[PDB]
């Protein structure tokens, strides 16, 4: 059924993150936490129903275009209880000025903007997991080979959401938040593209790879 998908989306979700725990994820330091989050995103995408039966390239075309959305919507999800503040982990709560200090720039404001928008919906666990896999399928990349296969996966998850929004207008309301997610993700990327170019702040393998995959 459709809840067999939903309950698999619930199962496959990355565990609650903590910066300084103590059985969950090990224990980081500062921004390696973000590096870990790319990795968690990547492995998640594999586990998405329909995904791993794309070609290897389309899996990469998909990931390279929307990976930051998926990530950011995750961080939106954690920050849902708190007001005017960003839940990096459960441990890590950062306000607007907290964000500037760690060299995030204007990103605090940007990310609160998205948080507010989802807060205005009291977004649910099942609903979020459904929307994140939906964001994943909603790629937009001129590099995708099988156009139909992604579209079918897209239609599929949206139908999964519709069949769920019954146990009614909440489908679209969730969907309506997606443009801000992409825009927000894009400001995150554009920021660290400046950092990249400044070349002073050191950056880790996967993140540069993702950054470089984008312009060309």
């Amino acid at each position: 059924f459709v809840n067999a998908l939903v309950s698999h989306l619930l199962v496959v979700e990355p565990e609650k993150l903590y910066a300084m725990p103590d059985h969950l994820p090990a224990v980081a330091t500062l921004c390696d936490l973000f590096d870990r989050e790319i990795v968690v995103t990547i492995s998640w995408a594999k586990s998405i129903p329909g995904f791993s039966s794309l070609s290897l390239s389309d899996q990469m075309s998909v990931l390279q275009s929307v990976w930051m959305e998926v990530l950011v919507l995750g961080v939106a999800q954690r920050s849902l209880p708190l007001q005017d503040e960003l839940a990096f982990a459960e441990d890590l709560v950062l306000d607007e000025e907290g964000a500037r200090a760690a060299g995030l720039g204007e990103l605090g404001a940007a990310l609160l903007q998205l948080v507010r928008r989802l807060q205005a919906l009291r977004l649910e666990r099942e609903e979020y997991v459904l929307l994140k896999a939906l964001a994943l399928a909603n790629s937009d990349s001129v590099h995708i080979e099988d156009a139909e296969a992604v579209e079918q996966l897209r239609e599929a998850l949206h139908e999964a959401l519709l069949e769920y929004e019954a146990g009614r207008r909440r489908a679209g309301r969730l969907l309506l938040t997606l443009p801000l997610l992409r825009q927000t993700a894009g400001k995150v990327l554009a920021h660290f593209y400046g950092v990249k170019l400044e070349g002073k702040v050191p950056m880790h393998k996967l993140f540069l790879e993702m950054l470089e995959a984008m312009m060309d």
Binding site: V39, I42, S43, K46, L56, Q59, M60, L63, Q64, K205, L206, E209, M210, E212, A213
Partner: peptide, 12 residues
Amino acid sequence: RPASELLKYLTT
């Protein structure tokens, strides 16, 4: 430069 770190995870 192929997507090395990305390839790893998607094929591990």
